[PDB]
Amino acid sequence: AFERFTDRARRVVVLAQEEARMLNHNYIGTEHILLGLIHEGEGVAAKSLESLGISLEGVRSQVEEIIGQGQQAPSGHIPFTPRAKKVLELSLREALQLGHNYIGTEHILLGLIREGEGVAAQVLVKLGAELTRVRQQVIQLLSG
Amino acid sequence: WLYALLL
Ligand SMILES: [Cl-]
């Protein structure tokens, strides 16, 4: 659970919620987690996506093409979709397997890849970043 | 945890 998330990882989740709000969405989908990871800017996830050429602009374009926006933004908390819940569950396991009791931004990105089937994965594939390529980039940047 | 935000 979130007590294990690093400060940056917690911020990724908050950013995902506010990305959804600003798109007038009323759920946090995997694509909002992806946007949150890019927004966070500092962590290993942000650096992995930037180094693959995956930008806020490319992801926003694809999310608008695939999901579009709502008419009216919601207030209060915006619930996770079932797939986003699965991504966050999987992030715990990714972090443990990489030897960490904390969940950092990279483990959220790895859990997103591991789920592999939501809007974020469609976006990444459309932008030319196959999931295995993202996973390899994360591992390579951690190997430094 | 695991409904919305940091819950
Ligand atoms: Cl982190």
Residue A21 CA: distances (Å) to CA of A14, A27, A59:
11, 8, 16
DSSP sequence for A91-113: HHHHHHHTT-SSB-HHHHHHHHH
Question: Which structure tokens are listed for A140?
Answer: 């390579």
Method: X-ray
Chain A residues with beta carbon closer than 8 angstroms to that of B5: 13-14, 17, 77-78
Q: Tell me if A28 sits within 8 A of A83, measured CB to CB.
A: no
A88: closest CA among A44, A68, A65, A118?
A118
Task: Decide: helix, strand or coil at residue A28.
Answer: strand
Residue-range domains of chain A with CATH: 2-142 (1.10.1780.10)
- Distance between CA atoms of residues A19 and A14, nearest Å: 9
Between positions 1 and 7 of B, the ones with CB within 8 A of A are: 1-7
